[PDB]
Amino acid sequence: IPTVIAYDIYSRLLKDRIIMLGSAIDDNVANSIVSQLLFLAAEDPEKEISLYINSPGGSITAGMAIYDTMQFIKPKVSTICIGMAASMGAFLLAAGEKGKRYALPNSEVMIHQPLGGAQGQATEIEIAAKRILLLRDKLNKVLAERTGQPLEVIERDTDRDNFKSAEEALEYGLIDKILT
């Protein structure tokens, strides 16, 4: 965590309206990011924001908190995938303002169905199946609207881990432009 004189490198990037997501998305990362987002929007509701995404994914809910603040704030948020955007990573990526979603040449993107668990009485196992199947449905609809694909294609394509090159992700409609 190098310093810039006083700043850590990320808060220095923050000053230029750049947010770095470099890790799995859990409730901590979500909180830091929603907070960076709220702060930037309060500073200049007019200027756009840049979110670099490199990430294996993580919590669906944490994921949606970030997704939802992206849309809810004034600034248009640009997303650049570097390395890998997988899972809730790809989702955040595809959540950039249309035309502003980027990847670098060697990026990967993966999309799949949600993972979870249930332990307990049959009744509690049912409650959890139900919830996760709705989660899977809520995400697919969001993805479909954002990629242009019909819901039933997203369903089939996310059945098992689905890995895409930057071209493939461009063709799929998850990103707009490959940067070079």
Ligand X SMILES: *P(=O)(OC(C)C)OC(C)C
Angle at 151 between CA 156 and CA 134, to 5 degrees: 85
Catalytic residue among 50, 55, 78, 87: 87
Residues in CB range of 53: below 8 A, 6 or more apart: 21, 79, 80, 81, 82, 85, 89, 92, 93
Token pair, residue 103, equals 């990847």
Straight-line distance from the first to the last Cα atom of the chain, in angstroms, rounded to the nearest whole number: 28
Query: Measured over all CA atoms, what is the biggest interatomic distance in the chain, rounded to whole angstroms?
Result: 59
- Residue 109 as a binder of ligand X (CB under 6 A): the answer is no
Q: Least distance from C-beta 145 to ligand X, angstroms?
A: 14
Q: Least distance from C-beta 158 to a second copy, angstroms?
A: 9
> 58, 81, 107, 164: which one contacts ligand X (CB under 6 A)?
58
Q: How many residues bind a second copy (CB under 8 A)?
A: 86
88 binds, among ligand X, a second copy, none (CB under 5 to 8 A by kind): ligand X
HEC secondary structure over 143-180:
HHHHHCCCHHHHHHHCCCCEEECHHHHHHHCCCCEECC
Rounded to an integer, what distance in angstroms lies between the CA atom of residue 111 and that of residue 109? 7
- Residue 87 as a binder of ligand X (CB under 6 A): the answer is yes
Q: What is the number of other CB atoms lying within 10 angstroms of the CB of residue 97?
A: 16
- Residue 54 as a binder of a second copy (CB under 8 A): the answer is yes
- Per-residue contact string for residues 10-49; x = within reach of a second copy by CB under 8 A: xxxxxxx-x-x-xx---xx-xxx-xxx-xx--x-------
- Per-residue contact string for residues 75-104; x = within reach of a second copy by CB under 8 A: -------xxx-------------------x
Residue placing its CB nearer to ligand X in the complex, 3 or 106? 106
Give yes or no: 112 in active site: yes
Q: Least distance from C-beta 175 to ligand X, angstroms?
A: 15
Token pair, residue 174, equals 């998850």
- Residue 55 as a binder of ligand X (CB under 6 A): the answer is no
Give yes or no: 165 in active site: no
Enumerate the active-site residues. 87, 112
